[PDB]
Design a protein around this ligand. Structure first.
Ligand SMILES: Cc1ccc(NC2CNC2)cc1C(=O)N[C@H](C)c1cccc(-c2ccc(CN[C@@H]3CC[C@H](O)C3)s2)c1
Ligand SMILES: [Zn+2]
Length: 316
């Protein structure tokens, strides 16, 4: 039969586009291997006329693309790009309303942990290392978050429709962000053992599991010693843009202007519901596209974020 062709562009990063000529007999998979158009999988689909001039994502099958993909995504996981496109295919159908001047996500496919994490990122000082996240985050901040939510799902290895833990998500995100200058100094005192001082850098310096209260962390918290007698661990110095204080969900009271934002978890382990509480002129509770205001909030809190620059203890 007659040989028909169109010109298209193939890419890994949507920065470097490569012109390709395609046969309208064969499928995209036959010609380039797995292929995607705005996340949809067209590997088994033959070219259409409307496809002419459009940009397609493909897998790296030569050194140029591999280098391009690594520089942009800072990963070599060969499933990464297929999971990103697979996820994006769903995240592009989500609605990202501006609630309180921050970008949220209308609830779908248990995205309540992603709404809350996205709302948190817009409230704390953070620079991602992978250009893919820098670029998607900047678009997200301005109300186009479908690529950011797709990359988060891809980086966190989560499927659409699966509920995730906000503390884990953020931890993964922190690992891909520049926190080299973040420092924390802890002191532990035991009447028997003595005083021991430890320094922490990066992600370890901005996160803590076992108390929501930044103030309690500075007074001291009780922890079990190696010896077995109770010991007091307290914060001596902290240099970071913020601190994330986590604990298993507990009835907690949040007071206006004593924190930046908090994750509220209702329900049971890995099958519950997240809400985002932020401190502005009053307390705002953001629940996807839903918003309510109050001067006071008691409820089950699991993460609390506090802004910070430089703290030093006046203890001893
Ligand atoms: C939602 C979710 C998804 C995935 C995972 N995956 C695991 C792999 N990494 C973690 C976790 C969770 C999770 O549920 N997290 C919450 C924070 C959480 C964390 C830890 C403990 C709990 C709970 C324990 C008991 C729970 C029910 N009771 C509430 C607690 C006191 C309130 O009065 C009522 S939740 C949850
Ligand atoms: Zn001890």
């Amino acid at each position: 039969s007659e040989v028909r062709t169109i010109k298209v562009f193939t890419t890994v990063d949507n920065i470097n586009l490569h012109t390709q000529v395609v046969d309208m007999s064969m499928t995209y998979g036959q010609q380039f291997g797995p292929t995607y158009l705005d996340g949809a999988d067209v590997t088994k689909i033959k070219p259409h006329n409307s496809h002419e001039g459009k940009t397609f994502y493909v897998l790296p099958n030569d050194d140029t693309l591999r280098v391009e993909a690594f520089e942009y995504y800072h990963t070599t996981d060969p499933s990464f790009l297929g999971r990103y496109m697979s996820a994006l295919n769903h995240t592009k159908k989500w609605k990202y309303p501006q609630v309180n001047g921050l970008t949220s996500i209308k609830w779908a496919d248990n995205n309540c942990y992603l709404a809350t994490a996205l709302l948190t990122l817009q409230q704390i000082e953070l620079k991602f290392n992978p250009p893919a996240l820098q670029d998607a985050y900047y678009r997200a901040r301005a109300g186009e978050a479908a690529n950011f939510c797709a990359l988060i799902l891809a980086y966190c290895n989560k499927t659409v429709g699966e509920l995730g833990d906000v503390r884990e998500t953020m931890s993964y995100l922190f690992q891909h962000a520049n926190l080299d200058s973040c420092k924390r100094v802890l002191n532990v005192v035991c009447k028997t053992c003595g005083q021991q001082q430890t320094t922490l850098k990066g992600v370890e310096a901005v996160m803590y599991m076992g108390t929501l209260s930044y103030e309690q962390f500075k007074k001291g918290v009780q922890i079990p010693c190696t010896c077995g007698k109770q010991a007091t661990k307290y914060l001596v110095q902290q240099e970071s843009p913020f601190v994330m204080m986590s604990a298993p969900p507990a009835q907690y009271e949040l007071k206006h202007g004593t924190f930046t934002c908090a994750s509220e978890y209702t329900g049971n382990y890995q099958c519950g519901h997240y809400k985002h509480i932020t401190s502005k002129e009053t307390l705002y509770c953001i629940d996807g596209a839903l918003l309510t205001k109050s001067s006071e909030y008691k409820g089950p809190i699991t993460d609390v974020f506090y802004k910070e620059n430089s703290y030093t203890t006046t203890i001893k």
